[PDB]
Amino acid sequence: ARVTVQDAVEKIGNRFDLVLVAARRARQMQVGGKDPLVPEENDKTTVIALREIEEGLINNQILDVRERQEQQEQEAAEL
Amino acid sequence: EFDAIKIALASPDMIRSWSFGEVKKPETINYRTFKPERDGLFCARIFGPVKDYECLCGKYKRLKHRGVICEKCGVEVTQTKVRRERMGHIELASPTAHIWFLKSLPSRIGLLLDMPLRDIERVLYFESYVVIEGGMTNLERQQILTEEQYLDALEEFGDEFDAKMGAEAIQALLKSMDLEQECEQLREELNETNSETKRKKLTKRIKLLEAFVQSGNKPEWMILTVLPVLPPDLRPLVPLDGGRFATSDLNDLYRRVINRNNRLKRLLDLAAPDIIVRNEKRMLQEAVDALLDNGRRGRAITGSNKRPLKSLADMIKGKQGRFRQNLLGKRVDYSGRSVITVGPYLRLHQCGLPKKMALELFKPFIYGKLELRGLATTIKAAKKMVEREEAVVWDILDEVIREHPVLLNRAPTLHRLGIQAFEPVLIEGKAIQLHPLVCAAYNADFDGDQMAVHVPLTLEAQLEARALMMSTNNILSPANGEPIIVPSQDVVLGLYYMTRDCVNAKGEGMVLTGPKEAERLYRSGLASLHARVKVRITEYEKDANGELVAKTSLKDTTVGRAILWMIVPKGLPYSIVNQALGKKAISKMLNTCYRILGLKPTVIFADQIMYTGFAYAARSGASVGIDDMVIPEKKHEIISEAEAEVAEIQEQFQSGLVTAGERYNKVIDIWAAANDRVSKAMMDNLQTETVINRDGQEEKQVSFNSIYMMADSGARGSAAQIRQLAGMRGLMAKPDGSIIETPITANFREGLNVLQYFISTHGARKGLADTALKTANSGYLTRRLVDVAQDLVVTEDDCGTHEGIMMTPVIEGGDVKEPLRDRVLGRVTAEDVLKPGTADILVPRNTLLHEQWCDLLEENSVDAVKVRSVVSCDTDFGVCAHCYGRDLARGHIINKGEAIGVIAAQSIGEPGTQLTMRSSIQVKNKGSIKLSNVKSVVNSSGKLVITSRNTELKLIDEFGRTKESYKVPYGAVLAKGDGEQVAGGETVANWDPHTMPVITEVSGFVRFTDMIDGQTITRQTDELTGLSSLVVLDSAERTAGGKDLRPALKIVDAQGNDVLIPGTDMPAQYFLPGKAIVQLEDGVQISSGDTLARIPQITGGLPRVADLFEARRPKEPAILAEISGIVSFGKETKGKRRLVITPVDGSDPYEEMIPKWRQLNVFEGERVERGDVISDGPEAPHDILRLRGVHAVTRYIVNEVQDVYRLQGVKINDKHIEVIVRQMLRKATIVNAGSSDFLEGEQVEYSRVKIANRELEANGKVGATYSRDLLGITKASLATESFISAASFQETTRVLTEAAVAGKRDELRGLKENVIVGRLIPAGTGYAYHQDRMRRR
Amino acid sequence: HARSTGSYSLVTQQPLGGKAQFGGQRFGEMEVWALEAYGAAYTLQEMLTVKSDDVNGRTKMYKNIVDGNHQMEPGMPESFNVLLKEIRSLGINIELED
DNA sequence: CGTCCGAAGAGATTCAGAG
DNA sequence: CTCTGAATCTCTTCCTCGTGTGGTCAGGACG
RNA sequence: GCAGAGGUUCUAGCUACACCCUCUAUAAAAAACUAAGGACCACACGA
Ligand SMILES: [Mg+2]
């Protein structure tokens, strides 16, 4: 569980792009079969995305490059 | 999905294209059967089938039959929702003018034809004939000709000449006129005529014609041949009410219009007599007028219950109109309401919420979880399971409320923090539980106060609610950096009781190992809660580079203060918990915790401090009782003295020594003195009377009385609110505001006399009615503030602009109202600040001034700091982050994107409910005195006199700061010199308030030039001193014989030669105006600084703020020097005196008319710069902006509105006022077109002209110059490039009419436009999407 | 007065003037301003479009939440279409560019 | 069985004073 | 005699949400 | 399971937001199940 998103916004100094990136992460977790990298503690997707951002391993750049790589092996799937 | 929205005049062919039919029967339905009329307002063939994919007959009733009409009735079969968009038209037999363009204030139809509106709506009402194509006649194309004059023309103009009448006649005029020809015809009249008013009217006509030669609009389209009808589902039959089917709405107006149209058709085919046809045409015109805009004529057509029936314009304007009732703010699903409950056990990140409310709001989530877990196969079974409230449903519910924020929402959401997110805690009950700390932010009571709860649905919504709207994320109010979740009422009282001390309390003296031992002693009951005992504490400080060092010492304190030490986080020092800890102390504590520790430690500390305050307030038992409020023993003697004094005053008045006015003033003064004395006696009895020992003989301590603790702590109460309990209630005013002579002597602890309670209820009813009016006024002001804003968002990060406003601590004659530390905090400077050491970069150019920088500023003793103002920002369609500054809600620079216009508007409008409605100069403290822009000459008395007018005493202390500032009236003598150290408590300048001296600059012999005793200045007698004094007769009183000659005073030496001004060839002449007493006659030498002639001589509430923000010109505006130069006079006050100022170098094309009753501070022998005041009184912001500049007017309005807010004890950061003012003056006027496409008369948004001229100056071309102008909020908001924003605000009919005439296209791009449409908002998370959309175009 | 989904109004504002009639509380103009002051553009958009009057939006949102994917299909408020029809009916062509 | 009848301010509009 | 400023007249709102009630075109008879 | 019909129940049930199976012109071995309408003006009251 979480109460505040302070450390997250020192991680992402926008307070607005943070919502967008964590929303994309939550969308990946729900719509897709993406496994959250931080193991949940009976937490919802919208708060586990903020937990992922808190550890600093998930933000706009890493999310963008990760989805780009997934698309790359999506073209490469059919060779 | 879709691009910009455009609006234009509706062509008749376009209306035909819209309509899917043409209604002919007035009847709407049959009552025999609810089937719609075959050709009526509700019709299947015209507007689609009534039922979902079924025909009227029922031949086709399946989805496969889509796209094919019926056979017997020929009605299309499609979805019923198609009935909400299919329109129809009415083929009017006679064309009818659209009332919006007809009865407009500028009268579009009348203005386009350049003929008066009286004539226009005379010919509409068939009571005067216009003359179409008059031709070879005396009558012209635009000519009035009523019945008798028409007959006179007809009987002798029996040629082919025709003069049509009616709306058809105006349609003929509009067809005949060519718009381009009229423009090129009126261009030369515009270029020739020099009359300002006449040219203003010509430009207004030319604008209208141009707005029609540019837009694809024809003037003839204003007269409407065909009247469109709404889809039936938008104006339905209304509920049956048992089959009653009845409501006075559009259906009724449409019925009457169709009836009149059918009558006109019948009369036209029948060839009825022209009088009857004309009357029926007038009836049809009136019917169409009532349909479009009822109430735009004298009689608003009235339906059942004798009330105006809503028209097609009454549902687009007003509070109940579609805009403000269904688009600006609309009702929502997933919403519930209940009364609120304290529930102190909660943390501010969470709130209580009833099980029923969580079950109803989260029904789709519960259904989804049931389907996922397979408890119910289908939504239908799951819905039945939710109805049964089966135990499995509650366990599922607890899963969907784990991390699902809800938006608690109080009804009067005055500011941003009105709605906040919370993690719901499922509680059994029916009342929402609101955290105690956020009640102050919500301004929410527990007296039946209800607040709605909204459930964010999408991951984006819940996520942004958690990240932004959580009470943990809202600690500092947007209005000011001060915390908003501060312990407010009860927890503060508990802390105040906790942090005190008896001089002799149980368990006082022994040393304590730490706070744990203090808690052990208090809980065990062997030591009092507040006993002065030395404790050992491990105080943590982060003086290192982020590392926290530990300091252990034996600080003398009390047990109660030691209890709080375990609550506070490590970083906070012990000096913050060692005081009485009132409301202000706790606010400062929380602010320091936020600025040092951060956000999460501040949240945890606030929760813990709330817990301890509540617990130890419960343990305190701080009750209230009769013995708790003490009557002063001296109150009786004070009352006796006051009665004796009023008796003496009345006896004096009876004899006649003092009349009514001075007697009333004396009685009021002595009663106020008695009230002050009894208040002081009450305070002494309430805080000093307490006698308690120290195991010795006798000692006196601060009282522990219940009411004193509940008032002094700031928990709840004030000075007057405690005076009205034990001391005299005071003089209570009548409804009109004049004070009752005899006060309410009795207090509330004692009884009140019946008359005393009558005066009390007079005051109470006055206050209640004032509040009832003031809340509405503040709501209107908040609406205006929001809507002049909402297009201003932080679009950039920096602009590299060196411009700004020089922030200086404000002095209004008294002490420092706001120090520079609290005035520039959180704002980014524009130029490097320097300490007394020159060329010192104390603070760099573009660094935000956080707490550390401001603290450094105070110890370096800075005086004025130039700072980047939002007004000075040159960013287009927004402002940059640096020019704005701190968010005031988070300890960092404003985020790139965040909407600050709405934040500022809400911050300004929130305290509107808390507002109201209705010599000599002495130095205060030790310090140096220096004068700014001063000219002085030493006199024979050794004193100092001023030659300038704006000399203004600034008191500089030994630190270099300005402790005091005083305005020096002209001619006031200064006892001390420049730079001379003065001791506080002695006057330095004194003057006669009712005298304007004409003190001479240079001493010498003065000869009476042009002085005639009898013609110009009469030698009046003196009955007081025995020596006659010459008094200059007034110009108006004196005749023209003595008026043509100009009074003057020539300066000469002993040899008779003229004396010239030092450095000026002009002799030092002095003009004596009317009513100037000259004691010194001719032949008398005058020393320097000697008086020549003794020339003799508001609101601060919500209306003042409204006037300031609407830029209302004051009733007595102050005249400002338009140009810089010497002053000359023209007319002999022939009704209106004229004044001319001519510069030494430039020309003098400016003349101003000044009434005689206006006092003038300027003479004709002194130099005045541009913007210097001439008359006396309030000065309009327009003149300040025109002359002194945009920065000067911004500073003036900021200072005025802050001074208005200062008196009510509410503080708002100046950046909000600055951004609102920037939105006010966003319009500009192009004085010279230059090479730009913009016309001179045209006013365009300052962003447009700035972009255009910066592009023109980018290359070798020269950009066009402009003149910015300041207009009020309610005028800046309507005058905006967005029609859909001005229409939603006010004057919707006028805004829509102007937009339809203009053909202007709204590009959205504003918060409120995108709100009305329903798309993403360019404020927060939507700003990135909008910028991506722009970069993709 | 808690409510999730219910019968809708003429203008298709779903809450149907909340009272005994099962209704949602008017998210008035002040509350819209309050969300505007926040960096709120998704919760505001959802509760001024997909939660109130977008018929296709409302149906899609309900089906999505019961599906478990809290995804907003934006669409357009039907109140704006009503406003367009009312302004057109006055005789003032107000339309949208594609 | 269906069918035809106060208050408060702004701005436009007269309206007026003075050469 | 034609505009100038000024008085006169007309428009346009004048908070923001709840909860209980109650009253509302009303064609009417004839082919 | 997207255009229709039938089935064991209960007139009718074809995804109508909607619940099971069959096929493209033919009707039954089969238990959990069903409905998709609804304004304005006034009064009083609460914050
Ligand atoms: Mg309350």
From TrEMBL, chain B:
One of its GO terms (molecular function) is magnesium ion binding. Residues 220-499 form the RNA polymerase N-terminal domain. Zn(2+) 1 binds at C55, C57, C70, C73. Its EC number is 2.7.7.6. It comes from the Bacteria. It catalyses: RNA(n) + a ribonucleoside 5'-triphosphate = RNA(n+1) + diphosphate. GO terms for biological process: DNA-templated transcription. The modification N6-acetyllysine is found at K954. It is an enzyme of class 2 (transferase). GO terms for cellular component: cytosol; DNA-directed RNA polymerase complex. Pfam families: RNA_pol_Rpb1_1, RNA_pol_Rpb1_2, RNA_pol_Rpb1_3, RNA_pol_Rpb1_4, RNA_pol_Rpb1_5. The keyword DNA damage does not apply. Residues 169-203 form a coiled coil. Its cofactor is Mg(2+); Zn(2+). Zn(2+) 2 binds at C799, C873, C880, C883. Keywords: Acetylation, Coiled coil, DNA-directed RNA polymerase, Magnesium, Metal-binding, Nucleotidyltransferase, Stress response, Transcription, Transferase, Zinc. The RNAP catalytic core consists of 2 alpha, 1 beta, 1 beta' and 1 omega subunit. When a sigma factor is associated with the core the holoenzyme is formed, which can initiate transcription. Belongs to the RNA polymerase beta' chain family. In the C-terminal section; belongs to the RNA polymerase beta' chain family. This is DNA-directed RNA polymerase subunit beta'. It comes from Escherichia coli. The lineage of its organism: Bacteria, Pseudomonadati, Pseudomonadota, Gammaproteobacteria, Enterobacterales.
